[PDB]
UniProtKB/Swiss-Prot annotation, chain B:
Effect of residue 156 to D: Causes a vacuole inheritance defect
Domain Dilute: 75-333
Domain of life: Eukaryota
Region (Non alpha-helical, tail domain): 1-390
Quaternary assembly: Homodimer. Interacts with calmodulin (CMD1) and the myosin light chain MLC1 through its IQ repeats. Binds to the membrane receptors SEC4 and VAC17 to transport secretory vesicles and the vacuole, respectively. Binds to KAR9, which transports BIM1-coated cytoplasmic microtubules that are attached to the spindle pole body into the emerging bud, thereby correctly orienting the mitotic spindle. Interacts with YPT11 and MMR1 to accelerate mitochondrial distribution to the bud. Interacts with SHE4 and localizes it to the bud tip. Interacts with RHO3 and SMY1, putative regulators of MYO2 function.
Protein's organism: Saccharomyces cerevisiae (strain ATCC 204508 / S288c)
Effect of residue 306 to S: In MYO2-338; abolishes interaction with YPT11
Function in brief: Myosin heavy chain that is required for the cell cycle-regulated transport of various organelles and proteins for their segregation. Functions by binding with its tail domain to receptor proteins on organelles and exerting force with its N-terminal motor domain against actin filaments, thereby transporting its cargo along polarized actin cables. Essential for the delivery of secretory vesicles to sites of active growth during bud emergence and cytokinesis.
Transmembrane segments: none
Domain notes from UniProt: The myosin motor domain binds to actin. The IQ domains provide the interaction surface for the myosin light chain MLC1.
Name the UniProt record assigns to this protein: Myosin-2
Curated annotation (Swiss-Prot), chain C:
Protein localization: Bud tip; Bud neck; Mitochondrion outer membrane
Extra remark: Present with 1070 molecules/cell in log phase SD medium.
Record's protein name: Mitochondrial MYO2 receptor-related protein 1
Recorded name of the encoding gene: MMR1
Quaternary context: Interacts with MYO2 and PCL7.
Length: 16, 390, 18
């Protein structure tokens, strides 16, 4: 598997 | 570990045949809009969840340089969305369309945000060759254009469908309906339709300019078709009829005034002025001279038509032949120097293109409890784990 | 992809939808 580039979407955490 | 997560993520992401099925069937075609009702406010989370899911999947594809995968993925996304909007009908027309208008808007705004980044920050050149970066930029650019096209398309399609749904109700409600006592759809139906549009757009966090554009268009459409119905009515046009018409159109005007629309009257000019003609005196030549100034949006031919089909009431003195002569003489006069108003059929400019795109500071990982998407949930959960670790 | 924008004829096709 290739090296991972910078993730574009700034994913935010969430909890219930 | 991180490399494990990245590994399973890769394995899931290159598997296009499952991801495409899941997305196009369970998320897109199997979309469930909140059936609670249009008046009921929502969080953006419950409105644009499909687009945000798509964004996480796409961004993770781009993370592992899976450009082709993204190509096919988004081709099917675009096609499926346009097809879904195209097949809408019935009680679900208003809530569904808006729903997709939100989601497309959410997607576009991200793609845009991507392009800029790819061009602005040098960091995105680190792990890829020059021509891979080139084809990447090309991809995202053409994708931006294609999402502009999609937004435009579903907007115009949905608006045309709305016009179609108004078509039947509006003619009966405005021209034929009689509210006032002493002078099937009613005005309450129209007002309910526009209430539903207003509240739906409000609850799905839709930008106001879109609302103004939609309602303006629909109102112009009503003005046009209803004028085209009135000017053909022969044993119908009278002073009482003018009174009731005036009342109805007044109800629409009030709806506009109370729902933030300044230029409603202007959208209902022909109906308003036709109502004004049927009420003001048309006995003296002076009265006709004033009539010319009141109906500043009606051609002399239309004036002649409306006057020549005026039905007199009990004990009421007919429109003088001298007056019919004078009017036909002004028509004669300005003919040298059609009567129907042709309704604008579209396509119209996308209002979303006349405002700033939605900013993209953050994307929330959320996959509605009732959803059935195993692979996608696996991807989003892995990504979420990875963010939790960092 | 390369999506094509809708024309007048397309909208007319949509108009006569069942």
């Amino acid at each position: 598997i290739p090296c991972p580039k910078t993730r574009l979407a700034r994913v935010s955490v969430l909890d219930l | 570990n991180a490399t494990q997560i990245n590994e399973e993520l890769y394995r899931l992401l290159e598997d296009t045949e499952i991801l495409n099925q899941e997305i196009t069937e369970g998320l897109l075609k199997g979309f469930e809009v909140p059936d609670a009702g249009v008046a009921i406010q929502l969080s953006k989370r419950d409105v644009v969840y499909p687009a945000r899911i798509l964004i996480i999947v796409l961004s993770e594809m781009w993370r592992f340089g899976l450009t082709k995968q993204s190509e096919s993925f988004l081709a099917q996304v675009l096609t499926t969305i346009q097809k879904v909007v195209t097949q809408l009908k019935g009680n679900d027309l208003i809530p569904s369309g808006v729903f997709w208008l939100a989601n497309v808007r959410e997607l576009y705004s991200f793609v845009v945000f991507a392009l800029n980044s790819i061009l602005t920050e040098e960091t995105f050149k680190n792990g890829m060759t020059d021509e891979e970066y080139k084809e990447y930029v090309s991809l995202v650019t053409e994708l931006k254009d294609d999402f502009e096209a999609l937004s435009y398309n579903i907007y115009n399609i949905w608006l045309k469908k709305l016009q179609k749904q108004l078509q039947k109700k509006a003619i009966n409600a405005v021209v034929i309906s009689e509210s006032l006592p002493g002078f099937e759809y009613t005005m309450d139906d129209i007002l309910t339709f526009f209430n539903s549009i207003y509240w739906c757009m409000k609850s799905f966090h839709i930008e106001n300019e879109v609302f103004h554009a939609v309602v303006t268009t629909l109102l112009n459409y009503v003005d046009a078709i209803c004028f085209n119905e009135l000017i053909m009515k022969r044993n119908f046009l009278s002073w009482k009829r003018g009174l009731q018409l005036n009342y109805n159109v007044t109800r629409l005007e009030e709806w506009c005034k109370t729902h933030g629309l300044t230029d409603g009257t202007e959208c209902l000019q022909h109906l308003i002025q036709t109502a004004k003609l049927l009420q003001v005196r048309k006995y003296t030549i002076e009265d006709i001279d004033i009539l010319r100034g009141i109906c500043y949006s009606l051609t002399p031919a239309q004036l002649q038509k409306l006057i020549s089909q005026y039905q007199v009431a009990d004990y009421e003195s007919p429109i003088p032949q001298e007056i019919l002569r004078y009017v036909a003489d002004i028509v004669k006069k300005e003919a040298a120097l059609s009567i129907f108003i042709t309704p604008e059929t579209g396509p119209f400019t996308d209002p979303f293109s006349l405002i700033k795109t939605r900013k993209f500071d953050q994307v929330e990982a959320y996959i509605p409890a009732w959803l059935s998407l195993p692979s996608t949930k696996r991807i989003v959960d892995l990504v979420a784990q990875q963010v939790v670790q960092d």
